[PDB]
Amino acid sequence: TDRDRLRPPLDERSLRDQLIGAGSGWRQLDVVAQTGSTNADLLARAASGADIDGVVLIAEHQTAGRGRHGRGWAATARAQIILSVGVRVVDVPVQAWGWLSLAAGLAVLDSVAPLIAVPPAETGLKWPNDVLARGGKLAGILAEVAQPFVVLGVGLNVTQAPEEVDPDATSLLDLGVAAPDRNRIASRLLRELEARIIQWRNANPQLAADYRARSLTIGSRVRVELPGGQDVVGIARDIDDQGRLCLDVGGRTVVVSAGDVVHLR
């Protein structure tokens, strides 16, 4: 396609020079041509005894991508920023681990928001980990546990065409960003991610405050698809200290730890 000409390879050396060294918490960065799932790969390293804290794995292409709740993640080569990072979480209370996921989505959103000329409606964060722009899914986040670590996975559509992955998908290119530089975006993303992880680790109140400011879900009428198939309709009001969605259901409070959110009119 013509989008191929808009997809130059990542510069691994440059990313390492920018993100590994004094002032940065990242300890290792690798760009692989192809893998099944970057999340699976880092989990596998951890399972074999590796210290994956601050370790970054980026894949140009991902052939067996994983979504939440056993779903899939589709990609074509060089069309996305596909990465996983390792985070040591054992030093943080387990009840707060849910916010690490929310922090990641916030980091992704902040890294790409200024690239758009004018931000269209419905641009922000859908609970739990959807980056939305113009109602389309720009990025998906997946957090998986492997003691003492959490592996955070980001799939960000840069030039990815919606017809290649999902009808509800969008990308930076489809938002009007003519020539997105994945090297620059990856660098900005990982710098934002480091900051949010540090905030999360120290229970910084600004994390929750910043999340609320970008939330498309809070204040909206929603249908929440719960694990198991049940649907609950209400109005989203807040996120609690565990990262759970608090719903107003006819005056009753329903707190959801996991589910798929659909924003209603």
Ligand X SMILES: C[C@@]1(O)[C@H](O)[C@@H](COS(=O)(=O)NC(=O)CCCC[C@@H]2SC[C@@H]3NC(=O)N[C@@H]32)O[C@H]1n1cnc2c(N)ncnc21
Site for ligand X, rule CB under 6 A: 37-39, 62, 65-69, 71-75, 82, 84, 137, 140-142, 153-155, 157, 160, 165-166, 169
Sign of the alpha-carbon dihedral angle for 182, 199, 109, 54: positive
Q: What is the DSSP letter of 246?
A: E
Provide the minimum distance between the beta carbon of 73 and ligand X in the complex, in angstroms, as a whole number. 4
Minimal distance, residue 250 CB to ligand X, in Å: 27
Beta-carbon contacts of residue 29 (< 8 Å; ≥ 6 apart): 12, 15, 16, 19, 20, 55, 56, 57, 58
**Smallest separation, CB 243 to ligand X (Å):** 15
Residue 176 CB partners (closer than 8 Å, separation 6+): 116, 117
From the CB of 4, what's the least distance to ligand X, in Å?
A: 17
Indicate the residue among 56 and 208 with the shorter CB distance to ligand X.
56
Q: Which is nearer to ligand X, 127 or 200 (CB)?
A: 127
Q: In the bound complex, what is the minimum distance in angstroms from residue 205's beta carbon to ligand X?
A: 27
**Rounded distance between C-alpha atoms, residue 50 and residue 45, angstroms:** 5
With CB atoms as reference, the residue minimizing the distance to ligand X is 140
Complex with ligand X: residue 65 or 98, whichever CB lies closer: 65
Give how far the C-alpha of residue 122 lies from the chain's centroid of Cα atoms, to the nearest Å: 17
Q: Which is nearer to ligand X, 205 or 228 (CB)?
A: 228
Closest approach, Cβ 81 to ligand X, in A, equals 9
- Nearest CB to ligand X, comparing residues 152 and 218: 152
Distance CA 200, CA 194 (A): 10
For 171-197, give one letter per residue: b (16+ CB within 10 A) or e.
Answer: bbbbbebeebebbebbbbbbbbbbbbb
Q: Which is nearer to ligand X, 38 or 187 (CB)?
A: 38
C-alpha of 256 from chain center: 19
